[PDB]
Amino acid sequence: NSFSGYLKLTDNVYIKNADIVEEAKKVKPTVVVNAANVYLKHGGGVAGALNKATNNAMQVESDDYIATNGPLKVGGSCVLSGHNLAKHCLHVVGPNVNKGEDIQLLKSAYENFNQHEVLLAPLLSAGIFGADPIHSLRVCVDTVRTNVYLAVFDKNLYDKLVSSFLE
Ligand SMILES: O=C(O)[C@H](Cc1c[nH]c2ccccc12)Nc1ncnc2[nH]ccc12
Prior knowledge:
binds the ligand O=C(O)[C@H](Cc1c[nH]c2ccccc12)Nc1ncnc2[nH]ccc12; globular; 19% strand; alpha/beta
């Protein structure tokens, strides 16, 4: 959990312009969060990047979890192996606004982070899931009380997010 160079937004929320895959390799975190869907099919966005960085080990483990336990619910999570990226991967399902899901469940999705004293995470329901990323950061700040280190790949979004907090 060697986190450094994050902007400290609040007492417990940190943000950095970084690829979550590269941060995970650098930081060696206890927990990396996946922006998952309910059947843990890691096809695109953050999930695709994390799975490809494990050379599909995450997808094989995820398929076994689903076969045995069935799909997650929106706002839910499970803990699986972090493989080479982290000790654990917390797979968290935020609502997919682009596929017509409800923004109230974004708070429930972020509540899962409170089970872990420190996490490396993406912004939930952002990118291809279609939520306003600045709203997602506000929900994170209001909901998560443990130490969350947010990786935002796109420097422009990072600067927009920091500006919404500082200006
Ligand atoms: O820049 C990117 O492509 C993604 C976009 C994103 C933010 N939240 C998500 C939730 C689900 C799907 C996509 C997104 N953001 C990233 N942030 C940090 N590291 C990353 N590695 C790959 C994408 C990415």
